Amino acid sequence: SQSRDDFDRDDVEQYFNYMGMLAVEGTYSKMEALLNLNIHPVDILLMLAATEGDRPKIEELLKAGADYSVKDADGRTAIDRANSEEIRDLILGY
Amino acid sequence: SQSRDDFDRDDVEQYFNYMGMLAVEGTYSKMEALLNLNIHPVDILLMLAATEGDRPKIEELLKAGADYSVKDADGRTAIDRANSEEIRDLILGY
Structure with missing residues (x-):
């Protein structure tokens, strides 16, 4: 009941x-779930920075003492969220 | 240097x-470039719906004649943009 030219810019x-x-x-909801669990913001930031493969943020957060073993609302850590093996190993190799 | 408590909500x-x-x-600009590249809107919509894994949208677009072989600015198709095997096969199996 619909053709190709029925879709426009x-x-x-x-x-x-x-x-x-x-x-x-959806991503706002995920943030509040993290903050509503009593996770320290610095560990939450590492979880996000890991998801994003954000190497400079990851390095900054680790230097400040971010813990990469803390579990999120799915029971998963910054290592689990790391979007690549290299990101995973950057975190583990600090 | 920085500390763990230097990070707040x-x-x-x-x-x-x-x-x-x-x-x-990033995605807005890429989308607008595809439009200005005179790729047909229905084919761009399939690329976006594939990225989203939006099964009802994908089926609507394929019925309407959307073509999953068209390549975006990175040379990639709606098949490539699919986020899972299930979405890939949904598109191919139509």
């Missing part, structure tokens, strides 16, 4: 913005 | 927002 931008909205709501 | 919130902004800004 506005349909692409609208889907982008809608999914962008759901992404902000 | 506001740091957690600011880091999520900073990373969320970078994500949005």
